[PDB]
Design a protein around this ligand. Structure first.
Ligand SMILES: NC(=O)c1ccc[n+]([C@@H]2O[C@H](COP(=O)([O-])OP(=O)(O)OC[C@H]3O[C@@H](n4cnc5c(N)ncnc54)[C@H](O)[C@@H]3O)[C@@H](O)[C@H]2O)c1
Ligand SMILES: NC(=O)c1ccc[n+]([C@@H]2O[C@H](COP(=O)([O-])OP(=O)(O)OC[C@H]3O[C@@H](n4cnc5c(N)ncnc54)[C@H](O)[C@@H]3O)[C@@H](O)[C@H]2O)c1
Ligand SMILES: [Mg+2]
Ligand SMILES: [Mg+2]
Lengths: 354, 362
C-alpha cells in the first residue's frame, strides 16, 4: 500500500512517502517543480539501475537535471569527495535555489546531506534512500556528515530534508545481506521502544524477507515514526533518550573495528551486539532468558548472526568499548546504564562465543 | 569598556570592546576553568598575540591547544580547514571544546565554519584583530571558505558564543587595512544612522589616530547597527539585509578587474559608495551636497573617491549584472536616499550607471 510519515523536528516538517513504483508518480519528487534545477548524487552501483529513470521523470516535469556519479564505498564519504560535488554544482552554475537529490544508501545520503547543508550555506535536499537501513535510519534525525581519518562522521551538520522518497521497488535489487542488515535496525526499534511492533515483526518477518509491499511499507513507516518520536523528545540530546538508538552498537562497533570494512556489515554486528546487550541485562539481574531468547529467535529469522566472530576473543572487544551500554529492560523498553563492570560485559560476550 | 548584546536566530552573545581586554577577568567568557579551547590563528598574528592569549586562558584554568595557519585569502579553503579538524582530533577534542578565531575575517570565517562542522557543531569565540572583522564579521553568523569557482560558496550560518575585541590589537594593523575597515564604518552611517555619520565627521581624526574612547564607541555602534538590520530581515526575505551591500556592486567590479590585493575591499567599497551616491543624484533622490559629505569623510579616512584610471564604464558593467544570461543583464543597486537612509533599486538603466561611473573617473 502507500504509507506516509510526516516528520516535524526543529520547527521543520517534511513528508516521507513509501510505495511500490513511487518514482513514477506525479509530484513524487515534490517539492521540486517545473523550471527548477536538481543535482542528483549517486554511486556507480545505483546509477545503471535508477539514475536514468529518475532523470526522465524529473525532466518530463520541467526540472533541469545534472548528476554526479561517485564510486561505491564508505571510503568516499570524504571531505575531498564532497568538494567534487561542489565543483560539479559550480561547473553547471547551480545557484542557491538548486536541489540536491541523494540517490543511494546512507553513504550517499550522508555525503549529499552535508553537501546540501554547506553549499552556499544551505540548499534544498531530497533523500531517495535505496537501502532498507537508510530508509529506516537515515531518513530521520537530520544527521549528515563525512569521515575524517581520525574519526567517523567527525565533520558534518544537522540538516533536514525537504522530503524523503521511498520506492519499495528499489529493494528488489538490494543484496539480501544488505536487506538483513537493515532488518537488524528494524528489530532494534521494537526492542528499545515498542514491544507491540516487536510482536508485529515476529508475526510478519517472513513477509518482510520476501519483500511483501504491505508489510514492508508499514515496517518502514513505523520505524520512521519511532525514530522521529525519540529525536523529538530530545532534539539536543538532553536526556539519554536518543542514545537508546545505540542498542547493540557498542558491542557491534568492536566487531566492525576488528573484522574490517565489509567483512561484517553494520547490521550484522548490531544483531550480535543486541544479543550481547541482552545477556548483559540478564547478568545484572534485570532481563530474563525468555526475553533474550525472543530477541535471538527473531534475529535468526531475519538471517542475522547471534554469535560473535570465532576470530575475536572477549579481550579484543573491550579496548574498542567504566563502560556505557544501552540495555533492554523489557522487549519494548530500554535504558542507558553507565558504570557496568568490564567483567560483566566479558561474561556476556563469552556467552555468545560460537 | 563597551558591550553589545546580539540576539539572532534564537542565539545571544556579547561583543565586549576595550583596550587591554585580553588581560581582563573573565575576558573569554563563556570559557571557564577546566574546559578546553583550540586557538586558530595565522602565521602573521601568531608571534604577536598567540602566546599572550594562551597565557591568559591557562591562568584561568583553560586547557589550550593551537594551530597556526598560513596567512591569506588564498588559504581560505576546505583543505586548510581540514588541518583544523586534524589538530582537534589529534589532541582528542570532544564536542565540548571551544574554537577561538584569533585573527581577521579570513581566520574568522574559516574557524567559524570549522566550529559549525566539527562533530556537527562546537562552541566558537571570535577574537577579531582587524577593524573590518570587528565591525562586519562580528555579527550575522556568515561563515565560509572559498572554492576555486566562487568566493564564500561553501559554509554555514553559525553564531559565536562571544566576541572579544581588544583595541590594542589595532596598534599592529597596517594603516591601509585600518582605512579599509573605516570604509565599512562609514557605510553604516550612510545606510542606517545619519547621526552616527555626523559623529564620524567629528571624530574620524581620532579614529585614524586609534583613540581608545572613539574607536570603542565606533565599533560598538557598528555592531549595534548591523545587528538591527540583520534582526529585522531574518524572517521577511525581500532584502533589508541587502542594504549592507551599499557600494559593493560597483566595488566588486573594481576588485574583479584590478585583481587580488591591488585594491583592498574597503577601498573598492569607498569608491563604490560615491558611485552609488552619484546614481542616487541622477535618479532624483540625492543632492550633490549629500554626496559631497560622503566624499569629504572618505578622503579623511584616506580612502579613494574615484575609480581606477585603468577602468572605463564598460569594464564595470559585465561585473555588476547579476549574470550575463539572456534573462539576466539586470543591474540591481543599493542606493542612499538620505545620509542615514537607503533602498534597493532594481533594474537601473545602464545609461544611469555609465553616467554615475563617468562622474567618478579621475
Ligand atoms: N542518521 C544518519 O545520518 C545515518 C544513520 C545510519 C547510518 N548512516 C550512515 O549510513 C552509512 C551506511 O549506509 P548503508 O547501510 O545504506 O550502506 P551503503 O550506502 O554503503 O549501501 C550498501 C551497499 O548496497 C548498495 N546499494 C544500495 N542500494 C542499493 C539497491 N537498491 N540495489 C543494489 N545495491 C544497492 C550500495 O551501493 C552499497 O554497495 C554509514 O556511512 C552510516 O554512518 C547515517
Ligand atoms: N559576515 C562575515 O562573515 C564577513 C564579513 C566581512 C568580511 N568577511 C570576510 O573577511 C575576509 C576579509 O577579512 P579582513 O579584511 O580582516 O582580512 P584578513 O583576515 O586577510 O586580515 C588582513 C590582513 O591583516 C593581517 N592582520 C590582521 N589583524 C592584524 C593585526 N592586528 N596586526 C597585524 N596584522 C594583522 C592579516 O594576517 C592579513 O594579512 C574576507 O574573506 C571576507 O569574505 C566575512
Ligand atoms: Mg546503526
Ligand atoms: Mg564589505
Amino acid at each position: 500500500g502507500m504509507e506516509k510519515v510526516t516528520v516535524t523536528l526543529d520547527e521543520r516538517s517534511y513528508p516521507i512517502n513509501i510505495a511500490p513504483s513511487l518514482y513514477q508518480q506525479q509530484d513524487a519528487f515534490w517539492p521540486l517543480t517545473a523550471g527548477q534545477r536538481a543535482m542528483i548524487v549517486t554511486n556507480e552501483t545505483l546509477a545503471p539501475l535508477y539514475l536514468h529513470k529518475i532523470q526522465t521523470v524529473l525532466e518530463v516535469s520541467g526540472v533541469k537535471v545534472d548528476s554526479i556519479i561517485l564510486p561505491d564505498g564508505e571510503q568516499y564519504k570524504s571531505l575531498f569527495i564532497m568538494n567534487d560535488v561542489f565543483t560539479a554544482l559550480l561547473e553547471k552554475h547551480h545557484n542557491r535555489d538548486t536541489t540536491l537529490i541523494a540517490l543511494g544508501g546512507g553513504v550517499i545520503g550522508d555525503l549529499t546531506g552535508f553537501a546540501a547543508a554547506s553549499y552556499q550555506r544551505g540548499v534544498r535536499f531530497i533523500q531517495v534512500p535505496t537501502t532498507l537501513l537508510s530508509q529506516v535510519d537515515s531518513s530521520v534525525g537530520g544527521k549528515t556528515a563525512v569521515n575524517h581519518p581520525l574519526g567517523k562522521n567527525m565533520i558534518g551538520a544537522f540538516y533536514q530534508p525537504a522530503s524523503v522518497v521511498i520506492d519499495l521497488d528499489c529493494l528488489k535489487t538490494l543484496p539480501k545481506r544488505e536487506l538483513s542488515s537493515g532488518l537488524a535496525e528494524v528489530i532494534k526499534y521494537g526492542i528499545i521502544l515498542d514491544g507491540e511492533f516487536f510482536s508485529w515483526l515476529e508475526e510478519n518477518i517472513d513477509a518482510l524477507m520476501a519483500l511483501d509491499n504491505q508489510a514492508m511499507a508499514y515496517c518502514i513507516r513505523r520505524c520512521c515514526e519511532l525514530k522521529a518520536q525519540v529525536v523529538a523528545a530530545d532534539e539536543k540530546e538532553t536526556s539519554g533518550l536518543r542514545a537508546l538508538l545505540n542498542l547493540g552498537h557498542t558491542f557491534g562497533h568492536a566487531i566492525e573495528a576488528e573484522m574490517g570494512y565489509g567483512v561484517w556489515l553494520h547490521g550484522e554486528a548490531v544483531a550480535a551486539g543486541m544479543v550481547m546487550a541482552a545477556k548483559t541485562a540478564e547478568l545484572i539481574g534485570q532481563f530474563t532468558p525468555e526475553q533474550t531468547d525472543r530477541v535471538i529467535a527473531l534475529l535468526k529469522r531475519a538471517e542475522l548472526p547471534v554469535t560473535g566472530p570465532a576470530k575475536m576473543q572477549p579481550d579484543d572487544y573491550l579496548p574498542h568499548m567504566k563502560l556505557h551500554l544501552i540495555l533492554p529492560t523489557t522487549i519494548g523498553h530500554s535504558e542507558m546504564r553507565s558504570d557496568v563492570d568490564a567483567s560483566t560485559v566479558t561474561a556476556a560476550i563469552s556467552a555468545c562465543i560460537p
